[PDB]
Homo-oligomer: A and B are copies of this chain.
Amino acid sequence: EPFFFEHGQHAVILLHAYAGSANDVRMLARALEREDYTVYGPQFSGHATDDPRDILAQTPAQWWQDTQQAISFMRQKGYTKISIFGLSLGGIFATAALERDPQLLGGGTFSSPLFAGNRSDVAEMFITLSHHQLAHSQFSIAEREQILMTLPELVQRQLQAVNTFTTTEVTSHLSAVTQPFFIGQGGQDELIDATVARQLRDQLPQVPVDFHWYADAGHVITVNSAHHQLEQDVLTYLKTIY
């Protein structure tokens, strides 16, 4: 389920990963809550159900609409000082928000690929994730095989749509960013993981970039061994933007 922690005038929106949920960022949310930040964790359409096909029925464009609805919802609550971050897939839409809304105070990305490219790692992870999730599912053995054996074709198409959305709507508008930008990146491979964050930093020369590589940690830095350092890094960054 989505969460909404109401505390102080400083409001933070946290977006989760592809095939994830608001639980991707809940621990980070608690670290900000302890420092009296208002934090909101919306869930993307199609996510957090029993059926992985619910994700494939949605589109990347719709998830961008979810991002705008989350920002407007905070303003509807009276909050004017808001920052928005995203984990993995969430970071793309978080960047899209910062590009198109100069009133946003800041935010950034957590291991987010902001340039279209090979997504063959997310596709296989989704298959491994879905198969393991289905082991506790309500579905029958036949239903599980219907889902599991049809995913690769649908997942490649959807991740392809994510690539097209990123290039035409996000990468082309990186120069529109006006706020101090936070970049965090997980991955123990410098040639591959660290450069995805470096490419975004080098594409943001107009703005200060708070760059962090967690070299000993995996990609999902919000939940792995990097989460303690990431929480302190985001906490230090938030003091700059507010």
Which residues on A are within 8 Å of B, measured CB to CB? 1, 19-21, 23-24, 26-27, 30, 48, 50, 120-125, 127-129, 131-136, 141, 145, 148-149, 151-152, 156, 186, 188-191, 217-220, 223-225, 227
Which of A21, A30, A131, A186 is the most central at the interface, judged by chain B CB atoms within 10 Å of its CB? A131
Contacts of A141 in B (CB 8 A): 1
Q: Interface SS of chain A: helix, strand, loop or mixed?
A: helix
Is B135 touching A23 in the complex (CB atoms < 8 A)?
yes
Closest chain-B Cβ to A152's Cβ sits at a distance in Å of: 5
Once A123-B224, A148-B223 are accepted as A-B contacts, the answer to whether A128 and B190 lie under 8 Å apart by CB is yes
Is B20 touching A218 in the complex (CB atoms < 8 A)?
no
Once A1-B141, A20-B132, A48-B135 are accepted as A-B contacts, the answer to whether A124 and B156 lie under 8 Å apart by CB is no
Is A120 touching B188 in the complex (CB atoms < 8 A)?
yes
CA distance A129 to B130 in the complex (A): 9
A117 to chain B: closest residue by CB: B188
**Set B20, B149, B191: member contacting A30, Cβ < 8 A:** B149
Closest chain-B Cβ to A161's Cβ sits at a distance in Å of: 15
Contacts of A220 in B (CB 8 A): 121, 124, 127-128, 131
Closest chain-B Cβ to A19's Cβ sits at a distance in Å of: 7
- Contacts A20-B135, A120-B188, A129-B132 supplied; 5 other A-B pairs, CB < 8 Å: A21-B135, A23-B134, A124-B220, A125-B218, A152-B223
A123 to chain B: closest residue by CB: B224
Which of A148, A188, A218, A223 is the most central at the interface, judged by chain B CB atoms within 10 Å of its CB? A223
Contacts of A224 in B (CB 8 A): 121, 123-124, 127-128, 131, 152, 156
Which of A128, A191, A219 is the most central at the interface, judged by chain B CB atoms within 10 Å of its CB? A128
Contacts of A133 in B (CB 8 A): 129, 132, 136
Closest chain-B Cβ to A194's Cβ sits at a distance in Å of: 11
Is A223 touching B136 in the complex (CB atoms < 8 A)?
no
A220 to chain B: closest residue by CB: B124
CA distance A149 to B136 in the complex (A): 22
Is A190 touching B132 in the complex (CB atoms < 8 A)?
no
CA distance A26 to B127 in the complex (A): 12
